[PDB]
RNA sequence: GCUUUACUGCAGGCUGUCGCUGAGGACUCUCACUCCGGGAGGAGGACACCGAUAGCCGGGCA
RNA sequence: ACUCGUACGGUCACUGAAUCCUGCCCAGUGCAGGUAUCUGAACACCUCGUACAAGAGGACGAAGGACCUGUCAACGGCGGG
RNA sequence: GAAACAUCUCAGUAUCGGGAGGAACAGAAAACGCAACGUGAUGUCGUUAGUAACCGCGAGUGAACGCGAUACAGCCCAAAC
């Protein structure tokens, strides 16, 4: 479907509307120095090593949106809920 | 599954084992310091159990009975002369450097004064081709050209009993025989023949192997069977 | 001022460096060719033998023991194993190669006691460690007022049950607080948890 | 022939034989060890902890 | 029990790297180390072996 | 162990006396050789980060793989229109 | 056992190798960290507590400091000279 790059919506911070910028989620990289890399390194020996053992899963026929609603004048960011759609193309 | 039949081999049981109490003699080069002065008459031609080729039994001039590889026609009341001065007769022993070039040589060599590695099976021989300082170049019976050390002994001639592999086993019974003699489990049971339990070949509802033969060199002891590491199979191309 | 005792020591903080690189390299390839117990008249480091108790009297022996360099050498499992207990090449023992040194020394000389060991260097293969063994059966020991202690029949075997100081600390019992709560009073009576 | 009655006339070699350390009809005459002290193979007695029930 | 391109692992083989290990991206040397030689001495040589780690193959085995 | 053995050897497999013979196929799988280029781990090295460290990135790149070739008395195949 | 199962669990259990004693082991702080102007070798008992902590964060696993007791005991080298 088609989405506006820019539009007028509510801000939960300004308490007031405001012109929204939408934007989609880029995946931040890991830093790798978190409790679960570390358990990583721990917990695994010789042999199985449980969870760490396990390979990612597959995917849905169809991902939700994964949208950033960037506030026009005071410049901050809020998530909202996500909609099945297969392809999400902006307008200008 | 069950250990194959190659690795049952290794652990040197009676069944793979070769006779060794009823073997004669370990056919050595004579330990000379400097001088040819040691030389010897031919009292006895014997067979070798370990080779089935015959091995000539040698009195040297300070009394010692030895028996050693003997080469084609050598006969009792012959003259044999082992060290560096040594004659250029067929049956003599003298290091590769004092051997002239394209004469048929034997019982080879490998580090000098190991007592002959090479060229020691019935009828063969290594053929002597170039010379240096520092290399004799020799021509194995495989066809190879071994880079060797000049000071590395070899018995001029042809190993004797020649032809051996002429003559058919024509049945099972002659077969027996030779192999009662050497470190050999035989009859031979096809691998195709067995259970899957026992080979990897083995099993199936008829006789065929299980994946292709060609097997790699990286293949570990009980999966390396068939065709190691075949460059190529086949008669034709 | 200085003792000549500082001088050992101090050659022995850099085993790769100075004269005793050069003493090192001549040194071991005698060893290599010597066995694996060799009774040796006079300490390589005297420094650390009298720091460790070595004295130059009447049954105190020193002894040098090569024991081989790396992890376990384990036998795969011939039978039904979980994932985790299928190991055989980064399993290593629980005894490190110095207390393996000092069991082997024990065994050689049945009579004495082991006092003490040090480290005497390693190679690409083995490593080289001198063992401090006293006779409690000897006068000149039993009057020793620094030494008597190993005369006590509870002091039997010392080294097999881990009272060396080798053994001591392989057990984990050189912190006295936190860390050693399934070490102290024995590896044993903590169910085999340190 | 079969593994059983008719095998067992065969059975005409010595093997187990009193023992000069524990007295038991356990050494081996062939292997000189005996199956029930250990006597030929080890200067301590044969025990085990499995002779008996583990908490026990 | 058995099979395999089932899941997960474990041996084993190949390969890089570190230690042993030294002198003057290719090369010379000899002093460790290896092998041959009864010995004198010869071949090889900082490689190989061995210890450690990494990648690949890996129903040979669990 | 083989081995008091050394290619006329002995290891690993297939077929199964003699006689007449043994066609075509290397695409897949296997094995083996080669490989400009691509991919390819760790150590060391360089950049960022941290008064250090974790960590992120780069350069280099072994075997292996991609790619090319050889091979069926190697696993096997020899159809429909 | 986890209602399968691989980490986990059974369990450092069964079993095996070595060794001492009448009891063993531990032990006079490079401790603790109710953070203190505080405690004062070590075992053990009660408690702290199924607490902190671990864990396909599943099933399960699981201390310590302190406190109340028991009994109490502190010393010897290496080196300097
Ligand atoms: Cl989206
Ligand atoms: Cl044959
Ligand atoms: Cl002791
Ligand atoms: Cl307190
Ligand atoms: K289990
Ligand atoms: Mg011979
Ligand atoms: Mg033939
Ligand atoms: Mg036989
Ligand atoms: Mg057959
Ligand atoms: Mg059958
Ligand atoms: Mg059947
Ligand atoms: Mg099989
Ligand atoms: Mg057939
Ligand atoms: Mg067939
Ligand atoms: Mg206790
Ligand atoms: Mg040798
Ligand atoms: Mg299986
Ligand atoms: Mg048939
Ligand atoms: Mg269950
Ligand atoms: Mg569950
Ligand atoms: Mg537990
Ligand atoms: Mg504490
Ligand atoms: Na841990
Ligand atoms: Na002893
Ligand atoms: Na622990
Ligand atoms: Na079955
Ligand atoms: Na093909
Ligand atoms: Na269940
Ligand atoms: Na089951
Ligand atoms: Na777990
Ligand atoms: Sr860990
Ligand atoms: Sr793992
Ligand atoms: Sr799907
Ligand atoms: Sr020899
Ligand atoms: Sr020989
Ligand atoms: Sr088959
Ligand atoms: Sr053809
Ligand atoms: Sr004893
Ligand atoms: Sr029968
Ligand atoms: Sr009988
Ligand atoms: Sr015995
Ligand atoms: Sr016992
Ligand atoms: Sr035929
Ligand atoms: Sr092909
Ligand atoms: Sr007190």
């Known amino acids: ?92 | 599954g069950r250990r194959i039949q190659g690795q049952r081999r290794g652990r040197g049981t009676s069944t793979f084992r070769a006779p060794s109490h009823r073997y004669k003699a370990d056919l050595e080069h004579r330990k000379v310091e400097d001088g040819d002065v040691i030389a010897g008459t031919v009292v006895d031609i014997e067979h070798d159990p370990a080779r089935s080729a015959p091995v000539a039994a040698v009195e040297f001039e300070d009394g010692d009975r030895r028996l050693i590889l003997a080469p084609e026609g050598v006969g009792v009341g012959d003259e044999l002369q082992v060290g560096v001065s040594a004659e250029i007769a067929p049956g003599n022993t003298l290091p590769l450097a004092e051997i002239p070039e394209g004469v048929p040589v034997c019982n080879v060599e490998s580090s000098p004064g190991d007592g002959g590695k090479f060229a020691r099976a019935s009828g063969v021989n290594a053929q002597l081709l170039t010379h240096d300082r520092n290399v004799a170049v020799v021509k194995l019976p495989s066809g190879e050209m071994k880079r060797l050390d000049p000071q590395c002994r070899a018995t001029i001639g042809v190993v004797a009993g020649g032809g051996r592999t002429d003559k058919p086993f024509v049945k099972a019974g002659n077969k027996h025989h030779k192999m009662k003699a050497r470190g050999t489990k035989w009859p031979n049971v096809r691998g195709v023949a067995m259970n899957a339990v026992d080979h990897p070949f083995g099993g199936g509802g008829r006789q065929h192997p299980g994946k292709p033969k060609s097997i790699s060199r990286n293949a570990p002891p009980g999966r390396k069977v068939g065709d190691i590491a075949s460059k190529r199979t086949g008669r034709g191309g | 001022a200085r003792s000549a005792y500082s001088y050992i020591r101090d050659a022995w903080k850099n085993p790769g460096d100075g004269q005793l690189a050069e003493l090192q390299w001549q040194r071991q390839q005698e060893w290599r060719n010597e066995g694996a117990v060799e009774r040796i008249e006079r300490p390589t480091r005297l420094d650390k033998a009298r720091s460790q108790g070595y004295k130059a009297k009447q049954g105190v022996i020193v002894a040098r023991v090569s024991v081989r360099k790396g992890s376990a050498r384990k036998r795969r499992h011939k039978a039904g194993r979980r994932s985790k207990r299928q190991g055989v090449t980064r399993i290593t023992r629980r005894k490190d190669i110095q207390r393996v040194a000092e069991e082997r020394a024990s065994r050689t000389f049945p009579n004495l006691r082991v006092l003490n060991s040090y480290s005497v260097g390693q190679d690409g293969r083995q490593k080289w460690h001198e063992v401090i063994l006293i006779d409690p059966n000897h006068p000149a020991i039993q009057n020793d007022d620094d030494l008597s202690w190993i005369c006590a029949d509870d002091q039997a075997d010392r080294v097999f049950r881990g009272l060396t100081g080798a053994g001591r600390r392989n057990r984990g019992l050189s912190g006295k607080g936190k860390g050693s709560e399934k070490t102290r009073p024995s590896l044993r009576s903590n169910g085999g948890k340190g | 022939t079969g593994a059983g009655t008719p095998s067992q006339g065969k059975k005409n070699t010595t093997t187990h034989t009193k023992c000069r350390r524990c007295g038991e009809k356990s050494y081996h005459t062939k292997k000189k060890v005996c199956s029930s002290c250990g006597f030929g193979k080890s200067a301590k007695r044969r025990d085990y902890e499995w002779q008996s029930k583990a908490g026990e």
């Open chain 1, 1 to 92: 479907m088609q989405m506006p790059r820019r539009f007028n919506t509510y801000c939960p911070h300004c308490n007031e509307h405001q012109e929204h910028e939408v934007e989609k989620v880029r995946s931040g990289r890991q830093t790798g120095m978190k409790w679960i890399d570390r358990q990583r390194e721990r917990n695994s020996g010789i042999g199985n090593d449980g969870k760490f053992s396990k390979v990612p899963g597959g995917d849905k026929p169809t991902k939700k949106t994964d949208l950033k609603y960037r506030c026009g004048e005071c410049g901050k960011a809020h998530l909202r809920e996500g909609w099945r759609a297969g392809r999400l193309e902006f307008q200008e």
